Design a protein around this ligand. Sequence first.
Ligand SMILES: [Zn+2]
Lengths: 259, 228, 76
Amino acid sequence: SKGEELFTGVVPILVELDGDVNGHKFSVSGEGEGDATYGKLTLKFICTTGKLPVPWPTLVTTFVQCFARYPDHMKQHDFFKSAMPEGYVQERTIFFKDDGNYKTRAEVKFEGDTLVNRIELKGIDFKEDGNILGHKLEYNYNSHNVYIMADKQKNGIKVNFKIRHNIEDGSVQLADHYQQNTPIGDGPVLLPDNHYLSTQSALSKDPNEKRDHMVLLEFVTAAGISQLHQVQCPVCQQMMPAAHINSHLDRCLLLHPAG
Amino acid sequence: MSKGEELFTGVVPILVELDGDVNGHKFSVSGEGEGDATYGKLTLKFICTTGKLPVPWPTLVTTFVQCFARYPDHMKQHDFFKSAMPEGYVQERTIFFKDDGNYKTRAEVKFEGDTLVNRIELKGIDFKEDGNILGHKLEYNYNSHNVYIMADKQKNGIKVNFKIRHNIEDGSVQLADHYQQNTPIGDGPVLLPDNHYLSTQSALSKDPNEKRDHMVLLEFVTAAGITG
Amino acid sequence: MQIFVKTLTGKTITLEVEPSDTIENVKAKIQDKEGIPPDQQRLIFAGKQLEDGRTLSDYNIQKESTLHLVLRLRGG
Ligand SMILES: [Zn+2]
C-alpha cells in the first residue's frame, strides 16, 4: 500500500482528548512516537485540567493501530496504514461490565510529519462507588487479542475485543470494546481477512512529573493468518468467541422471539 | 539508605547468562541490555545460542534483576536488592506450572565491574511432551503481576511469592506458581523489608533483523503496598 | 431479486432469489456458490432464524435484505 510507505521509520505522534464522564469534564494531551517496523508505540499523557476523574488504564485503548507490525505475509491485511495519510475515523463503544460505558470518536490522520489522534469521549451511567469512579483499578495492563473483520458495506473494519482491567482487591473488571473504523478519504483501502493484532502494554510514571499523567508503552504485532475470534450475535449484538455462537443462539433466538 | 543504592542512580548495563536443562533438552541463552532504576525500566535482548529454545520464551521471563525496581522515596528502606550490591545476592526459585512440570533455578546477581550480571542455572523435570510448555502452546505475550515480598531474618534476606498468568494458544490460562528466596552474597549489612510488593509489567517482542531464536523484553517494575 | 448473506468471516455473498423460494432452496444456492453443506447453515434475518419449509416472504424478506449466516459444524 501507499499509506504503508509512511511507516518505515519513527513517526512522531500527538494525541488530544476532550472527555466528559458522568458530568466530569476533562482534557488530556499526549505525544511521543510510533515505529511500525518493530510494532512499538511510546507515549506520555498529561491531564491538563488537573486530576483525571477516571483511571488512566480505562483510557489506554482510546489513546493508533496504524503502528502495529504486520508481518510480510499479512501486509495485504493492513487496513490502518492503507487509509493513510487521509486517515480514518475510529469509533468505539466500550462497556464496563456491571457499570457505565464510554463512546469515543476519533480521527487518526497525518498532519505533516506527525500522526495525530483526536478524540471526543462521552461517558455515562457510571457508579459513583464503582471500580471506575472509585478509582479501584490497579495501575497496570495486560495482553489482549484485537480481532479484526472486514466490513465491505462500510468500506472499513469491524473490530472486537475484551480488556481485562485488574482491580486492587484482586478481581478483574472487564471492558467489551466494540469498534469500527472508516476511511476519511475515497482512496482505496485494504479490506482484510479475519485476523488479530497481538497487543501488550506497560504503564509507568515519569518520576520528574508531578502533574497527573501516564507513560504508555505498547507492542503490537498482527497474527492469526477461528473459534477464538470475537463476533457479534446477529440477534442481540453481544460479542463472544466464535466457539460459543451456536449454543448462545439456541438460547438467544428463544429469548427474543420477535427479533 | 544503602551503599548499593548509589550504583543504580543512572543507566546500568546488564548481562544475562543462563544454562538450561528441561526434560533432558539442554540449552544456553545469553542476554544483554540495560536497566534504569530511577524509572523502574528494564530492557533486554536474549539469544538462544544452542539453536531452538526447547521451551517457550515467556516461561523464562521471570528467570531472566529485581534490583532495577523503582522504589519510591518513602520505600527506600525496604530495598533488599540494591542494599546487597555490589557483592550481590543469590536468587532461588521453584516454579510449578499447573498440571505440568516444574523449573528449579539458582542465580547469582551481582556487579562485575560496572555491568549488572545475572548468571542462572535452570533445571526442568516432569514436563508433559504434549503439554503447553514442551508443546509450545503459549502465546508470545505477557501480563502484569504483583510480586509479594517478606523479610527472611534467619537467612538475612527475603521470601517472595507470586503467580504468573501465561496465556495459551487456545484461550485458556496456565498458572506458574513462583516460590523465591533471595540471600546476600556478602557479609555486609543489608536492608530487611517490611511486607510490600513489586508491581510488574512486561511486553515481549522481536528484533525483525535477528535470525536466531530470540526475545526482546521490556519490564517496568515499581515497589508499592506501603502508603505515602 | 438479489439479497446478501453476511458471514462472520467478514464475507458478503450476494444471491439470486424469488420470494417464493423455500429456505432449503436458499441454503442450496448458498452451497452452490460457497460449497457449504445446507445442514451446517443457520440463516438469521432481523433477529429471527429461518426455517426449512417456509419461504423468503413468510419472513417478508425483500430485495437487498441482508441475511446472517452462522455455521454449525455438526448438530445442524
Ligand atoms: Zn444473542
